[PDB]
Design a protein around this ligand. Structure first.
Ligand code: 4NX
Length: 94
């Protein structure tokens, strides 16, 4: 438990591109909990095959919409606070 329970349930309003991303893997809402956002990101990552083959906890998102949104070419799925930081730039808490 890296992230406070209440923060994980924060109601959030993705910005237009993050929203676009989430809907492209089947999300149907305008607002989400952070847990839900993470669910659809997981789907996105797996379908777009962005995991590194050798280091399966590393996501290579360079040249992908995800990389544009997060502002980085790669990250570790083990660093939740870092991921949250990157996600927060792409939404607003309601
Ligand atoms: O490491 C994971 O792989 C997943 O299976 C898919 C994933 C989601 C988001 C990101 Cl940025 C990277 C990978 C996963 C999950 C997180 N929530 C879930 C809900 C379900 Cl039902 C299944 C998998 C996961 C996790 C857990 C997790 C938890 C918090 C954060 Cl910030 C990032 C990932």
């Amino acid at each position: 438990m890296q992230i406070p329970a209440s923060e994980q349930e924060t109601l959030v309003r993705p910005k237009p591109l993050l929203l676009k991303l989430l809907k492209s893997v089947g999300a149907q809402k305008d607002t989400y909990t952070m847990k839900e956002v993470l669910f659809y990101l997981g789907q996105y990552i797996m379908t777009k095959r962005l995991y590194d083959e050798k280091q399966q906890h590393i996501v290579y998102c360079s040249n992908d919409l995800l990389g544009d949104l997060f502002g980085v070419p790669s990250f570790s799925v083990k660093e939740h606070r870092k991921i949250y930081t990157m996600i927060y730039r792409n939404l607003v808490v309601v």
